[PDB]
Design a protein around this ligand. Sequence first.
Ligand SMILES: *[C@@H]1O[C@H](CO)[C@@H](O[C@@H]2O[C@H](CO)[C@@H](O[C@@H]3O[C@H](CO[C@H]4O[C@H](CO[C@H]5O[C@H](CO)[C@@H](O)[C@H](O)[C@@H]5O)[C@@H](O)[C@H](O[C@H]5O[C@H](CO)[C@@H](O)[C@H](O)[C@@H]5O)[C@@H]4O)[C@@H](O)[C@H](O[C@H]4O[C@H](CO)[C@@H](O)[C@H](O)[C@@H]4O)[C@@H]3O)[C@H](O)[C@H]2NC(C)=O)[C@H](O)[C@H]1NC(C)=O
Ligand SMILES: *[C@@H]1O[C@H](CO)[C@@H](O[C@@H]2O[C@H](CO)[C@@H](O[C@@H]3O[C@H](CO[C@H]4O[C@H](CO[C@H]5O[C@H](CO)[C@@H](O)[C@H](O)[C@@H]5O)[C@@H](O)[C@H](O[C@H]5O[C@H](CO)[C@@H](O)[C@H](O)[C@@H]5O)[C@@H]4O)[C@@H](O)[C@H](O[C@H]4O[C@H](CO)[C@@H](O)[C@H](O)[C@@H]4O)[C@@H]3O)[C@H](O)[C@H]2NC(C)=O)[C@H](O)[C@H]1NC(C)=O
Ligand SMILES: *[C@@H]1O[C@H](CO)[C@@H](O[C@@H]2O[C@H](CO)[C@@H](O)[C@H](O)[C@H]2NC(C)=O)[C@H](O)[C@H]1NC(C)=O
Ligand SMILES: *[C@@H]1O[C@H](CO)[C@@H](O)[C@H](O)[C@H]1NC(C)=O
Ligand SMILES: *[C@@H]1O[C@H](CO)[C@@H](O)[C@H](O)[C@H]1NC(C)=O
Ligand SMILES: *[C@H]1O[C@H](CO)[C@@H](O)[C@H](O)[C@H]1NC(C)=O
Ligand SMILES: *[C@H]1O[C@H](CO)[C@@H](O)[C@H](O)[C@H]1NC(C)=O
Lengths: 136, 136, 338
Amino acid sequence: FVGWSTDWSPYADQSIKVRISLKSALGDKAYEWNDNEMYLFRSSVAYAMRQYFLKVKNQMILFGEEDVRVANLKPRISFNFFVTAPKNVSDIIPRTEVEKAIRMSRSRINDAFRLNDNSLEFLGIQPTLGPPNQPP
Amino acid sequence: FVGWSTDWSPYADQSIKVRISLKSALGDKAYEWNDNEMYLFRSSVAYAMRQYFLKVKNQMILFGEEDVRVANLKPRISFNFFVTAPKNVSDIIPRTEVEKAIRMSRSRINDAFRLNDNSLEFLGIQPTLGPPNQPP
Amino acid sequence: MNNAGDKWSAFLKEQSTLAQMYPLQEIQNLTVKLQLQALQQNGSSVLSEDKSKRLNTILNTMSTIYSTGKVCNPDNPQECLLLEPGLNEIMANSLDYNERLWAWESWRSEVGKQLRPLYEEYVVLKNEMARANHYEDYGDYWRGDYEVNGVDGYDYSRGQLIEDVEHTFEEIKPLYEHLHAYVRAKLMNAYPSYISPIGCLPAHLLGDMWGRFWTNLYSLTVPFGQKPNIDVTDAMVDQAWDAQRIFKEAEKFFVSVGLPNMTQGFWENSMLTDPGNVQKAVCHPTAWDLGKGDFRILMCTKVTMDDFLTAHHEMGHIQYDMAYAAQPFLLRNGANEG
Ligand SMILES: *[C@@H]1O[C@H](CO)[C@@H](O[C@@H]2O[C@H](CO)[C@@H](O[C@@H]3O[C@H](CO[C@H]4O[C@H](CO[C@H]5O[C@H](CO)[C@@H](O)[C@H](O)[C@@H]5O)[C@@H](O)[C@H](O[C@H]5O[C@H](CO)[C@@H](O)[C@H](O)[C@@H]5O)[C@@H]4O)[C@@H](O)[C@H](O[C@H]4O[C@H](CO)[C@@H](O)[C@H](O)[C@@H]4O)[C@@H]3O)[C@H](O)[C@H]2NC(C)=O)[C@H](O)[C@H]1NC(C)=O
Ligand SMILES: *[C@@H]1O[C@H](CO)[C@@H](O[C@@H]2O[C@H](CO)[C@@H](O[C@@H]3O[C@H](CO[C@H]4O[C@H](CO[C@H]5O[C@H](CO)[C@@H](O)[C@H](O)[C@@H]5O)[C@@H](O)[C@H](O[C@H]5O[C@H](CO)[C@@H](O)[C@H](O)[C@@H]5O)[C@@H]4O)[C@@H](O)[C@H](O[C@H]4O[C@H](CO)[C@@H](O)[C@H](O)[C@@H]4O)[C@@H]3O)[C@H](O)[C@H]2NC(C)=O)[C@H](O)[C@H]1NC(C)=O
Ligand SMILES: *[C@@H]1O[C@H](CO)[C@@H](O[C@@H]2O[C@H](CO)[C@@H](O)[C@H](O)[C@H]2NC(C)=O)[C@H](O)[C@H]1NC(C)=O
Ligand SMILES: *[C@@H]1O[C@H](CO)[C@@H](O)[C@H](O)[C@H]1NC(C)=O
Ligand SMILES: *[C@@H]1O[C@H](CO)[C@@H](O)[C@H](O)[C@H]1NC(C)=O
Ligand SMILES: *[C@H]1O[C@H](CO)[C@@H](O)[C@H](O)[C@H]1NC(C)=O
Ligand SMILES: *[C@H]1O[C@H](CO)[C@@H](O)[C@H](O)[C@H]1NC(C)=O
């Protein structure tokens, strides 16, 4: 293949793609996705990372809203984010740990935006519906 | 009165007191209020301030989690916070504007922590129940 | 003066290097040991060349930042107010809460912010030097001025100073609380709705820039303002008191208690009066002990009661300097810095 694509990078494997459907889960009375909503989303992701690193690895890492880098924002509200080290951009948290962190605190992220597991798709993290307990 | 109290300050009028009751609104399955929860709360407050300054005064101000200063944390989960200028501590947003911002986006703050207007009391901002519409 | 000071400093440093040949572990003479301690302190010579240069650079930078600190209105950056003129007048004369607050905050945001990183580096370097001189911290090096060892009953440890100061301040506190309460009550009437009767005093309402002195607050806290204070300046003017006889009166006061007279050359070499505009000289009242029985006073003395008291103060300094003239040059100083 002759040429190159300006979208592939050696660290692009670590990106996690988020797709948000505001007007399907809420219908009317649905807020618009401006920069403040992106700030809140990055804060929620950083909070989830903090919770995972505190409750599993027993490490206190001060993540922030600037450590969740977001790209490829589109009107569907579907972007790619990756979480780096607190003050060291060259270090990227591996995607497995980020997926575990999202799984641990997905309910809180869902509640922060009033979305339920179908309008907030992380495209690689699939929810579990729950076993259907049987009568005696 | 002879002596002085180490808790009064000329800027103490601008503080807003928050009282949180986790184990009454949730009973069981209630998370603990560690530092990550405080980080999320400050992020939510900064988001509310951004929304108010964008949708009312038409000013784009980059608030952050460091611009919501919190003091007097106690096991009841009742503290005092005030919001300052984005990168200028000497400037304090007047309490009236902060109250308006909280009123505008109180539902989002309530949803972020799964609390409903009774377990998250801002002690000065009272909610409105809603008019009871009458039959014909 | 720069050449003379450099020569003196070089001589002191080389003599300090030479003094290391006699350790204190074998000196049995108290006076000789004290002179050895005075001439043996390495000081800043114990650090490396890079560290010493960095320390001098940051010290000079902080001094220049403090000296050149100016508050400028953003509307017109050309016009600025310095610390010594105007800004002190604003803090010591204005009765406007907002104006004093602006002056205070501007001074502490235009100078302090520029000094914070330099001060962090200064703290680290001073700690390094003190540890290199067998001191736990630089504060211990400062407290060492009151250290006494090897003198029975009179020994004093560097850690004893902190406890003594805290114990003394605990006894001072009852008086300071009442003074603070009275000052707060009196200030409630001059800055209403800003001074809480239950809380503390805002920092910018203490008559001075930093609150170090409450003297300028006197006009707002005088107990009985209808009774004038004791002033004798006009009495001096009526009796034609020049800046030559007040020093004679102070000398008579000193001799009345048995202290010796003044030296013959003191009056001739002194500058008890301002030299006018022809000769440029400083005006801070200072006492100079040049040595070999040469004691002088420099003062742009006016005709004022405060000038009389300052002349008495400088004559006290002069008498103290004269008292220990027979002592070795290394011992020609007070018992401590106070
Ligand atoms: C911000 O985050 C970034 C991350 O993005 C971070 O950058 C990293 O910093 C660490 C710490 O300095 C770096 O780790 C160093 O790497 C040096 C590079 O030399 C080595 O490079 C190869 C590394 O492979 C390792 O892992 C593989 C798989 O496990 C293993 O097989 C390797 O053996 C090695 O352990 C390695 O291939 C390479 O090979 C040399 O030797 C082989 C023979 O073994 C020879 O055949 C090769 O030709 C070559 O000569 C080499 O080993 C490395 O020098 C350095 O090691 C020194 O220090 C450690 C202690 O720290 C000693 O144990 C060791 O003996 C050496 O003295 C260390 O391993 C990492 O590479 C950075 N990554 C990037 C992308 O930059 C920043 O530091 C962060 N910044 C802040 C401020 O936090
Ligand atoms: C970070 O945030 C902090 C906030 O905490 C911010 O600090 C503020 O910065 C602004 C801008 O520089 C400051 O505003 C300046 O204030 C200067 C102070 O002098 C005035 O102080 C009193 C202010 O009262 C004002 O408001 C009242 C009520 O509306 C009004 O009555 C007053 O007239 C005045 O408008 C004032 O009382 C005082 O009075 C003087 O004059 C009276 C006669 O009128 C006399 O009787 C008094 O004795 C006294 O001499 C004085 O007016 C002020 O100098 C300055 O004004 C200059 O610039 C403006 C343009 O900017 C011109 O219009 C004006 O003519 C002057 O040239 C300006 O008003 C504010 O005080 C700061 N507050 C604090 C707490 O520090 C920082 O800047 C922020 N930092 C960053 C990086 O963003
Ligand atoms: C410590 O040394 C000093 C200095 O020698 C002694 O003080 C006197 O100093 C003069 C002038 O230098 C000498 O002429 C005397 O011989 C010194 N001794 C006396 C007794 O006058 C001081 O005495 C010495 N201290 C002790 C304890 O011997
Ligand atoms: C001063 O420095 C020298 C070496 O530079 C060292 O031997 C000595 O112990 C230090 N202290 C004194 C008091 O001389
Ligand atoms: C002391 O000095 C004053 C003036 O300086 C002089 O009048 C007086 O005579 C002197 N004392 C003696 C004993 O001469
Ligand atoms: C689905 O299963 C996971 C574990 O596999 C569990 O944590 C999650 O709560 C389940 N979802 C339910 C019960 O709704
Ligand atoms: C209560 O009234 C306010 C306006 O006064 C309104 O915004 C709010 O939604 C009301 N609460 C309801 C309808 O539950």
